[PDB]
Amino acid sequence: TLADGDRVPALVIGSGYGGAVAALRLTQAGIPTQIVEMGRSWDTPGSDGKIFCGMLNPDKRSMWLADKTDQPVSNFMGFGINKSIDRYVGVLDSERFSGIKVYQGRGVGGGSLVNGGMAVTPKRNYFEEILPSVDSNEMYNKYFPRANTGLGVNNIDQAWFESTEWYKFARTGRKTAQRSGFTTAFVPNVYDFEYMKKEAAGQVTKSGLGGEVIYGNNAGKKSLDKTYLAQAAATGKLTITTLHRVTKVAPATGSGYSVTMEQIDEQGNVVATKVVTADRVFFAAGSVGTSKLLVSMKAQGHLPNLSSQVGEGWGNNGNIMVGRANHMWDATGSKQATIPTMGIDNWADPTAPIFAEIAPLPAGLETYVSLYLAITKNPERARFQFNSGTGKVDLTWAQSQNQKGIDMAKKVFDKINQKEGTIYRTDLFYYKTWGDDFTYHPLGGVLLNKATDNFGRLPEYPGLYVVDGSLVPGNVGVNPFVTITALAERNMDKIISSDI
Numbered sequence: 046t047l048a049d050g051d052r053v054p055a056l057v058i059g060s061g062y063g064g065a066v067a068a069l070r071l072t073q074a075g076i077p078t079q080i081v082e083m084g085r086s087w088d089t090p091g092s093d094g095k096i097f098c099g100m101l102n103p104d105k106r107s108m109w110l111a112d113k114t115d116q117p118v119s120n121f122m123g124f125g126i127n128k129s130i131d132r133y134v135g136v137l138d139s140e141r142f143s144g145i146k147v148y149q150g151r152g153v154g155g156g157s158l159v160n161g162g163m164a165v166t167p168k169r170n171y172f173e174e175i176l177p178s179v180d181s182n183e184m185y186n187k188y189f190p191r192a193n194t195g196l197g198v199n200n201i202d203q204a205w206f207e208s209t210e211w212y213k214f215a216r217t218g219r220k221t222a223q224r225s226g227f228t229t230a231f232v233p234n235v236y237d238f239e240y241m242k243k244e245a246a247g248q249v250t251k252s253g254l255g256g257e258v259i260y261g262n263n264a265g266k267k268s269l270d271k272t273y274l275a276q277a278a279a280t281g282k283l284t285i286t287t288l289h290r291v292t293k294v295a296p297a298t299g300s301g302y303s304v305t306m307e308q309i310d311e312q313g314n315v316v317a318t319k320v321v322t323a324d325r326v327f328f329a330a331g332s333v334g335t336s337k338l339l340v341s342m343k344a345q346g347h348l349p350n351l352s353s354q355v356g357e358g359w360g361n362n363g364n365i366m367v368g369r370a371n372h373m374w375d376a377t378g379s380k381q382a383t384i385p386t387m388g389i390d391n392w393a394d395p396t397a398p399i400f401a402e403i404a405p406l407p408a409g410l411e412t413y414v415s416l417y418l419a420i421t422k423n424p425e426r427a428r429f430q431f432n433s434g435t436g437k438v439d440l441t442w443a444q445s446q447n448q449k450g451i452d453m454a455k456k457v458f459d460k461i462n463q464k465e466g467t468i469y470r471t472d473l474f475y476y477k478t479w480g481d482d483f484t485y486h487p488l489g490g491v492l493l494n495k496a497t498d499n500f501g502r503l504p505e506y507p508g509l510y511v512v513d514g515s516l517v518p519g520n521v522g523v524n525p526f527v528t529i530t531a532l533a534e535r536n537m538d539k540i541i542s543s544d545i
């Protein structure tokens with residue numbers, strides 16, 4: 046664990062997708078690497094003997110330093126309860142800005158701990174439009190495959206999918222989508238589907254078939270600590286320091302960068318502060334975490350020479366959640382896997398460009414609800430800005446900016462409602478139909494080739510690199526983590542061969 050006064054060759058801030066890629070490639074190149082993570086390592090059993098808590102009866106392990114459990118669905122037939130808990134270094138951070146809540150994973154593995162495991166490669170044509178500076182041949186011939194393979198991506202057995210009661214909700218969602226002319230697609234995942242069959246057979250401990258996902262999975266889900274980070278640790282050159290929040294990065298005297306961090310206990314109390322010197326720093330604190338850091342450092346005069354583009358172009362991957370009421374003959378089932386495997390792909394339609402996951406609502410009883418999380422091609426963006434008064438970084442995103450996304454989603458769902466003669470639910474979230482006040486997919490803030498060079502370097506400060514979701518221009522049209530991993534793979538390849 047890092048100590049005040051230490052000097053290290055390479056320091057990776059954060060341990061999500063970008064961080065895990067940076068750590069693996071650096072250590073394989075033989076460079077001793079330190080990861081600093083603000084959350085805890087999730088490899089120690091809790092009170093009940095399990096590492097993570099489930100969603101039906103969550104405890105303090107659920108939330109990052111909060112007083113109530115939380116998720117988008119709110120108090121709906123027993124699901125999504127807001128129970129009082131003690132402040133603890135739990136796994137899911139519902140980080141509130143003025144116009145949006147940004148859900149983020151905290152701990153060794155970052156968002157991989159809490160996400161739905163959906164591993165989607167973006168459409169080449171859209172990729173080529175939004176990231177024109179990137180050689181797409183390299184991406185599709187090499188980096189995307191490298192990412193999918195490293196992540197442990199696999200596909201569900203389609204025959205098993207058709208027969209199992211656990212995916213009845215997905216079959217119902219497929220049926221009504223197709224009746225209205227919409228294309229559906231299976232979605233690859235890092236959840237071990239062979240393990241899932243055994244869960245269904247009652248031969249192994251249930252996780253995905255046991256009400257677990259958003260506060261972690263005790264089995265089945267291949268989070269980064271089981272893949273990239275395990276491989277990085279196998280080199281013998283990785284050190285992970287947990288419960289340390291990086292608060293400041295500034296040029297050190299002579300060379301390198303002073304990195305200030307707050308050590309916290311498991312209740313979130315700062316117990317000590319340390320400053321270490323690093324020759325190279327890799328920002329992988331996430332779209333929000335890295336943007337807040339760099340926007341603060343620039344505003345407070347620590348890295349005053351950073352680009353004017355730092356803080357610009359944040360987006361929410363057009364996230365909109367909605368639920369529809371099925372008629373009684375279209376039940377969705379009392380047994381629902383927590384891992385989505387199917388989506389509605391309408392991205393090609395210029396008038397309603399959305400890719401919607403058919404999401405489970407694993408309440409354990411028949412609700413007749415079809416739930417969807419839509420990625421819409423919402424052009425709206427926002428920026429982070431340092432608030433002098435408060436000393437905090439604000440996000441200028443306004444909830445009204447989700448209106449364009451709702452209009453796009455509505456074009457698809459209104460058509461299905463018209464065909465099926467159904468209405469939307471208005472009770473899943475305060476009498477609101479559209480879940481438009483949160484995102485699971487923060488993207489941007491430090492755009493590739495705008496705030497950084499074409500490989501994620503901050504050119505004004507040699508030795509500083511950005512390798513995470515802050516690089517992505519606000520929207521990729523699909524679940525983001527594969528893109529973040531593949532971009533990180535591309536960047537590390539170049540940086541290691543060119544700079545190191």
Ligand SMILES: Cc1cc2nc3c(=O)[nH]c(=O)nc-3n(C[C@H](O)[C@H](O)[C@H](O)COP(=O)(O)OP(=O)(O)OC[C@H]3O[C@@H](n4cnc5c(N)ncnc54)[C@H](O)[C@@H]3O)c2cc1C
Nearest residue numbers: 059061062063083155156161162163291334514524525526
């Ligand atoms: C509920 C939910 C469901 C999702 N489902 C999917 C899905 O199925 N598929 C998909 O593609 N995407 C999904 N996502 C999004 C995906 O998880 C993120 O896009 C991804 O994890 C971002 O990768 P990253 O490396 O940019 O950062 P993160 O994975 O967010 O990692 C950032 C890490 O840095 C740490 N950190 C932050 N600030 C500091 C600091 N100052 N000091 C030190 N450490 C710090 C954080 O604790 C965290 O561990 C989902 C997200 C959520 C919240």
